[PDB]
Design a protein around this ligand. Structure first.
Ligand SMILES: *[C@@H]1O[C@H](CO)[C@@H](O[C@@H]2O[C@H](CO)[C@@H](O)[C@H](O)[C@H]2NC(C)=O)[C@H](O)[C@H]1NC(C)=O
Ligand SMILES: *[C@@H]1O[C@H](CO)[C@@H](O[C@@H]2O[C@H](CO)[C@@H](O)[C@H](O)[C@H]2NC(C)=O)[C@H](O)[C@H]1NC(C)=O
Ligand SMILES: COc1cccc(C(=O)N[C@H]2C[C@@](N)(C(=O)O)[C@@H]3[C@@H](C(=O)O)[C@@H]32)c1
Ligand SMILES: *[C@@H]1O[C@H](CO)[C@@H](O)[C@H](O)[C@H]1NC(C)=O
Ligand SMILES: [Ca+2]
Length: 441
């Protein structure tokens, strides 16, 4: 159990820095990189003369270990005081089950919360999650997006595999409704997960195979389940055309060591433009300059398969081993959205000072969330670039459609489409099959 404690007002941070003894493997892109996007954002605001000057932001950043129980154990730190550092708002978590588990504790103490990745439609329930907001859309849209992809290609008989829990179940139920409207019948609907209600990944692949007419299999699954289902498929000589949600997205980790069985996959992911300034930041970090991050050496030891095999002192994060994670944009926006609301509240309460006046000493969370956090700023570095929340505190339903191919020896994810309110595709760009040399024996 490590942490990042640094400010006049402090922000809580929650990231899945670790994965599966249920913490033991670093999450390089969705963990380490995301954490550092919050650290970059806090340094940037703390230098911004126009946004929140005279009020320096500090942090309390904690690991969720990709589990809601761990996340809740961790979140007690942000509320121990109200039972030493006084947390204004919480940035995180990533995963919907975590974000839900945290929101349950944080609403009791009136702490605003902003997720940069939790897409579960369950979180749009403002009666229940009255202190939660997110820079991402609900999966009501992603399900409609995927349904529309099937409709376009006339995928009339498909199967579904979904993760149990707060992301997959809600996810696939919307898909099921969206499919029903577009005259799409589900061949087999299976569910995967830790509980004893669920079949094995090998049993699920068998249920998909025992339905030969369904070549397309829709996935509303987490990354761990996605990696496991793909492995079970490889272990069965099963070749399906996967259409997967952001849980899989454009991630190499899911497909690593099982490239052949996933070839021709169509994965979604939220529409984002890389924050170029952050590219310079991350790349500048190394295990000798970055002391503020307690997990950074474990990350560095992992990414480079060496010890601190011994690492080379001259090693660096660069274009040869790095590409900005798809949702980094959303991490920065979540930090900035929090910072803008605090600025609005201060300009009201303390108009004759930049500083945190007597009127803003005891923070009113209910006022901070409802009267302020529902703001409008142009995303910090054309028209759909403004950070805002709907009445339910959700972000905009905008997605990029990807295709898993072999460009010429190197496996990668190519953008083949987008979803705004309607769908668009570059059909000629998509590769549905592996370019495998014929066999003559
Ligand atoms: C998807 O299906 C539609 C039909 O629902 C295809 O469009 C044509 O629709 C007219 C309707 O009067 C038919 O007469 C044509 O025969 C259809 N074309 C074909 C080739 O089936 C549409 O082309 C299909 N699109 C894809 C990409 O599969
Ligand atoms: C396929 O889905 C459509 C959804 O609208 C079903 O409804 C038809 O919609 C068109 C709209 O242009 C109408 O002209 C038809 O009269 C509708 N059909 C009926 C029976 O209401 C459509 O029925 C579905 N396909 C089939 C063959 O049932
Ligand atoms: C590894 O353990 C878990 C546990 C729970 C979820 C997942 C998971 O992969 N969840 C996916 C879907 C997600 N949009 C969501 O959870 O709401 C965020 C997406 C992302 O962060 O980019 C994860 C993994
Ligand atoms: C700011 O200062 C002026 C004195 O010139 C005072 O009248 C005004 O009430 C002050 N505003 C607040 C909210 O303290
Ligand atoms: Ca500042």
């Amino acid at each position: 159990r490590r942490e990042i404690k640094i400010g006049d007002l402090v922000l809580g941070g929650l990231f899945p820095i670790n994965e599966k003894e249920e913490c033991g493997r670093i999450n390089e892109d969705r963990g380490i990189q995301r954490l550092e996007a919050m650290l970059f954002a806090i340094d940037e605001i703390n230098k911004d003369d126009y946004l929140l000057p005279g009020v320096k932001l500090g942090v309390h950043i904690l690991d969720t270990c990709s589990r809601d129980t761990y996340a809740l154990e961790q979140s007690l730190e942000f509320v121990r005081a109200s039972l030493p550092l006084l947390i204004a708002g919480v940035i995180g978590g990533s995963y919907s089950s975590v974000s839900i588990q945290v929101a349950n504790l944080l609403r009791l103490f009136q702490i605003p919360q902003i997720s940069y990745a939790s897409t579960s439609a369950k979180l749009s329930d403002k009666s229940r999650y009255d202190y939660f907001a997110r820079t991402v859309p609900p999966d009501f849209y992603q399900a409609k997006a995927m349904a529309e992809i099937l409709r376009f290609f006339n995928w009339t008989y498909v199967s579904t595999v979904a993760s149990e829990g707060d992301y997959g179940e809600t996810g696939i139920e919307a898909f099921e409704q969206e499919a029903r409207l577009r005259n799409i019948s589900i061949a087999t609907a299976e569910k995967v997960g830790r509980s004893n209600i669920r079949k094995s990944y090998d049993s699920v692949i068998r249920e998909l195979l025992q339905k030969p007419n369904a070549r397309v299999v829709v996935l509303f699954m987490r990354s761990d389940d996605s990696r496991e289902l793909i492995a079970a498929a490889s272990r069965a000589n099963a070749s399906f055309t996967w259409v997967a949600s952001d849980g899989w997205g454009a991630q190499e980790s899911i497909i690593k060591g099982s490239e052949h069985v996933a070839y021709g996959a169509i994965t979604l992911e939220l529409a984002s433009q890389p924050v170029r300034q952050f590219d310079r930041y991350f790349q500048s970090l190394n295990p000798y300059n970055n002391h503020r991050n307690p997990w950074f050496r474990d990350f560095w030891e992992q990414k480079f398969q060496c010890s601190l095999r011994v690492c080379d002192k001259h090693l660096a994060i660069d274009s040869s081993n790095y590409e900005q994670e798809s949702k980094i944009m959303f991490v920065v926006n979540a930090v900035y959205a929090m910072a803008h609301a605090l600025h609005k509240m201060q300009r009201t309460l303390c108009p004759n000072t930049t500083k945190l006046c007597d009127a803003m000493k005891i923070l009113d969370g209910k006022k901070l969330y409802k009267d302020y956090l529902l703001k409008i700023n142009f995303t910090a570095p054309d028209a759909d670039s403004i950070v805002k929340f709907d009445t339910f505190g959700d972000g905009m339903g905008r997605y990029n459609v990807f295709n898993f191919q072999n460009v010429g020896g190197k496996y990668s994810y190519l953008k083949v489409g987008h979803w705004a309110e309607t769908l668009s595709l570059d059909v000629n760009s998509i590769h549905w099959s592996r370019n495998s040399v014929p066999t003559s024996e």
